[PDB]
Scaffold this active site. Structure first.
Site, short mmCIF file in Angstrom:
data_model
loop_
_atom_site.label_atom_id
_atom_site.label_comp_id
_atom_site.label_asym_id
_atom_site.label_seq_id
_atom_site.Cartn_x
_atom_site.Cartn_y
_atom_site.Cartn_z
N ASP A 109 0.78 -1.24 0.00
CA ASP A 109 0.00 0.00 0.00
C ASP A 109 0.82 1.29 0.00
O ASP A 109 0.48 2.25 0.70
CB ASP A 109 -0.95 -0.01 1.20
N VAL A 116 0.05 2.27 6.24
CA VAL A 116 0.84 2.79 7.35
C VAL A 116 1.44 1.68 8.21
O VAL A 116 0.98 0.53 8.18
CB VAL A 116 0.01 3.73 8.26
N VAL A 145 -0.67 -0.52 10.84
CA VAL A 145 -1.80 -1.28 10.33
C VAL A 145 -1.44 -2.15 9.13
O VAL A 145 -1.46 -3.37 9.21
CB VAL A 145 -2.97 -0.36 9.93
N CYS A 146 -1.12 -1.49 8.02
CA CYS A 146 -0.97 -2.18 6.76
C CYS A 146 0.34 -2.97 6.70
O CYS A 146 0.58 -3.82 5.86
CB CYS A 146 -1.16 -1.29 5.52
N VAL A 147 1.21 -2.67 7.66
CA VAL A 147 2.46 -3.40 7.80
C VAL A 147 2.37 -4.37 8.97
O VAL A 147 2.69 -5.55 8.84
CB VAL A 147 3.66 -2.46 8.01
#
Ligand SMILES: [Cl-]
Ligand SMILES: [Cl-]
Ligand SMILES: [Cl-]
Ligand SMILES: [Cl-]
Ligand SMILES: [Cl-]
Ligand SMILES: [Cl-]
Ligand SMILES: [Cl-]
Ligand SMILES: [Cl-]
Lengths: 202, 202, 202, 202, 202, 202, 202, 202
Positions: free
Chosen positions: D18, D113, D116-118
């Site tokens: 992302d 971010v 979260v996305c990591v």
């Protein structure tokens, strides 16, 4: 060999501990603007997922002051435990009674101050076997050093350190569950994201 | 899994290690004003909860200098171990004798410098099975980097990192135990809280 | 439970890894003045306690550059392993052979950059059962963030994070062992302490 | 007993999660200039070692925006999973399928971010037995505090915190494997190192 | 109309004001390492250009302490005015006499603390028509805030704010005047420049 | 009482002073990534508006090093004055003649270091009646303190402090003059703006 | 041209503006400990030099709160102008009447907040021909940015920016006037100086 | 000599310049949360005192994006000048026409970015004799350095640097003019003050 114990909207309760008008004056490890926004963001999230919420205050009839108006306007029927004496909220039997009454295993906690009013019940709840998720940017204290010491003590006990945005996303799981409704929370509490929404709409 | 080993006013002792006029010149990770206030706050707490207190200095007859006057004047009857040689206070037999003579299991420790005069006896005490509570904002050192390294080394050993306010609150447990007396301490060492008390009084 | 594995001047070796003229240009997480002073301080300590020392460089016939002149001059009899290729010094057979030849169990390590040229052999040495003490303020890297990541990775492996001053004090143990000689080191690398010594002398 | 699990160029895959034009606007814990360079540095490294790479986006047909052009152009044969809903990439079956299809055990991950996305797929991957290496300086989020909390949550789970430079060096092992090629990467993403190369060349 | 009143090595004198062992402990707007190097850098520059130099102290027979040993050893025949009382050095008749005896129009001034022991004689000298050059990085004070205020008051009076490196370069004018001699100063007080010199020499 | 002397693309020349491989190592008041980007941004702008450009170096056959490759590659036919001796570029007759040959009134200047190689010719040029515009984010020096001192000395002289973005906008005046061409510069040197352009394109 | 208009203990008056319990909660550009100490330091100085003092408050019967007790107890005979309405104290006729009644020409001012309750009467007093000395570290506001802007507006008007220590030294002029008395103030408000005094006394 | 030219609610107009959704993404010298609050605070103030308000945008039909919704909703009758080309708003004849049509001498200005879209019309307006008041905390730019440079250029031209709170108070003059109404603004944009109001209400 490892378990991702993640927030489930059916297994979680939210604890707002002592966000009082007087005590907030002690918070210097966050700017007043960001801190107000973060606490309100967590609050919108607790509402959005209809999580059982518990409000508690410490000595509110003294210099500590009343609970901030938003929390009462927002959860008018949440259990409200005014602790006249006990500093650690877990030492109050009415508070513990209310927590267990929810039947929730996961406890999402935020409050003032981090090193005391948050850490103490966090450590007590962990001792009783609860999964505790600390909303770090919705918890304030005297300075960055005190905050870091508190983090060290809570992680050593096995608390999971998070923030209101990551809490919201782990509860939400999927964008398609409610795009408009969840997007409203992000827009309302992330000005940078609100700008993206406006640019995208043209 | 986890046990919340919290401070008990009947099971704890306070150790002031090398708060000397010369050595304080080395502390740059706290402002002189905040550090003096923090050390004095811990001292008021030690007096208020009637904790056995131990004072110790390192090479006070050299550039390291005398113990700060406030500590000598406040605890004139506390054991005072002036170490001519041993850098680690635990390598001094008189010091360990005084610690064990208190018969306390929990050791509250603060001093200068953090990475040495605090860390070394902390690690020694932890090896001997004591529960050690480090007052992080009443312990100073050269810079934030050296401090963070000392923190890492101590948490790895099982030290509990805290601050004078959280130490005081965990000892006090309940506001109703002594409202005015405890409030006087908070008011005297938290200017933000003193202001709240004054506004509340009109 | 916990064992205080502390530095012993008869059981320690010092590893200076890649303090080269070119690579030092990459260190931005310390000021050039403080970093130069810290490395030289560690060098004086190693010389003072006559510790077996090993020097190693990485691709010094390129942009990485020669070893800083002070290190070659202070340790003309130290093993000097110029690694043409291997980034992890532990992948060099001559370096490892030299380390074990010291017969030391404790390895004091410092270098540039922290996240690579220090972290990699640190993790390797820990795997082979060595007690590794990392001198954090004599090791430099690109920025504070990269440094913190390296600390996280090294503590997770059981490295002990320290600084040149705490290294010196843990080795020295007792002031009375050599007051003038050790005081000379403190005076030479702690300007604040040199000032105390001068004021005390009047 | 510690085991040094280091990156193997034949056992590793890279996950770009992302890095989208809209979401990047949320990254404030890195400057835009340094963050862009860091992500591109990781990309050059993935290309240099021919690591299997996976690109994924979150709700790219909304305010989150398209994947940045560089990643798309540098990995034209990589699996591209556009996730319409799932915030945690591991909750997407196409994404997980693509990860396991590489047959790699070690996962090098970066994205936006961080919290979260990591973090979420990192924790999920660790649960399924993968070794996860987090490129911390190629992952961004709202502020340094949120970042530190994400780091705490990821290290507690056994993720390894690194940076693009340490990733490159651990993959490369030996300078002589490709001096010109590897030096080009360092020159292109470390301005200080490019300067060394230029001075050295005269 | 603007006139570039730049330093001339035949029309300048250097004033070292109150760099005393005690007073230096008050300097917190510079690290001890960088500040010692800066003051010694300025001293080396005064030596290199054979500039008339004046040393002065404030109440050196009290807690303020003696002048640092380096300054006495480096300018042993320079006027040494020990002020028992006057805080502003310009209020001391012997001091003013020594300044005017040099017959210099340009005054290079540095000392401790910036807002008092430097600022006061700077403002007085400006009133008498002298051109005053303040070496800002060789002058220290309590904190950056106090420093900025001191700068504001001095620029308002027409003082020229500089630093030891620009002072040296404006005096030197041409590299070819003394390549070895001047390069030695830069190498000895700019570790980064020392590194450049060493790489260049191979 | 005030005249807005703004940049005119027909009245301006750009001066690049001593952006050399060695000297750039001295720049610590900007990160290497942001500084490289800013200098190249200024460079793209000078080319975009076809401004007469002058390149100059200080002692490039020594440790100061060669001029950075990008500047020579972009301005291969620009006047290039290699100064063997004079530190102030204005003391070099070839440099001044090359400046006056442009017939330009406004001088846009950037370089290393700010307090010397930028400030000195800036002050000299102001003395000769030129309007000098200092590109503050394309000029580097040792630290923010030295930077602030240099700014103070230059504004007192009537220099206008700016940055590469404001330089370009004041030169460009109107977006419609060249939307794509000017947008490429912003996109190429402002990642946040590049992201806006990409989102806008869907 | 320039005149060094310095504080004279026979020509100065001190103005404490709105150091109220509520308003102090707004001060975030200083830590509470340093700010409390600074205001009291200024108070000790005014008492020490018997300077005419004026206390004034803004809407003290509202959220702004009462004047802090220390100011009330140390200046029991000072004029106390409680302003119900006027934000600018100079718009209050009683306040201006009290200022002129002292017959003092130099005005030393400190208060909360800096950009308003200090800046507004500062600018008004300058308009009436008073010489105004602003104690910058005894005046607080929302953040450093607002503070810097306030400094800019005040210096442009000809206010002299100072701090409590420099104010004390400029009034005192000579150490020998009262060594014991003046040293007591420094010891009481400069902990580092207290340490020097104690070390000196052994 | 000096005249206190303070804001008069009958002689001032407010200029909102380019607070656009895309451009706000470039603001990194303020957190997104505090900046949104500051801009909205100024808007409430402009409305409260019935000030003539002007809204203007730059290339809003591109990546710069639309004007933020709050401003359009609040001021539906304010002149809205959408500038297709001119970067400096003063180069737009419709904008200048709208400003002069207000007949106001004092211009309160805020926008994005500070160094360009605010600085350029500020300098132009100052040239035409307007009194310009810059709201510094409601103006954003790339980083603190660019901000400080913009301030220098504006103060040098005679601009008055202020903030929304000081702007409001200078306009308001007297609390008693509208206690409830003005208190709502402070309560709504100063979280710390809202806390004081709530505590006071009990
Ligand atoms: Cl209770
Ligand atoms: Cl001993
Ligand atoms: Cl090798
Ligand atoms: Cl999906
Ligand atoms: Cl005297
Ligand atoms: Cl020349
Ligand atoms: Cl009034
Ligand atoms: Cl236009």
């Amino acid at each position: 060999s490892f378990t991702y114990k993640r927030l489930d909207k059916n297994d979680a309760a939210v604890l707002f501990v002592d966000h009082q008008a007087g005590l907030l004056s002690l918070v210097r490890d966050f700017s007043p603007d960001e801190f107000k926004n973060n606490v309100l963001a967590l609050a919108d999230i607790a509402r959005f997922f209809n999580l059982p919420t518990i409000l508690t205050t410490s000595f509110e009839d003294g210099p500590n002051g009343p609970l901030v108006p938003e929390l009462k306007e927002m959860f008018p029927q949440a259990p409200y435990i005014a602790r006249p004496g006990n500093i650690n909220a877990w030492d109050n039997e009415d508070f513990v009674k209310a927590v267990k009454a929810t039947g929730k295993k996961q406890l999402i906690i935020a409050g003032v101050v981090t090193d005391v009013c948050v850490a103490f019940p966090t450590l007590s709840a962990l001792e009783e076997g609860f999964d505790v998720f600390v909303v770090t940017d919705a918890s304030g204290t005297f300075n960055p050093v005190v905050r870091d010491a508190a983090w060290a003590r809570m992680t050593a006990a096995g608390a999971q350190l998070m923030n209101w945005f990551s809490v919201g996303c782990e509860l939400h799981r999927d964008w398609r569950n409610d795009i408009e409704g969840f997007g409203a929370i992000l827009g309302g509490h992330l000005p940078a994201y609100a700008n993206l929404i406006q640019s995208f709409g043209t």
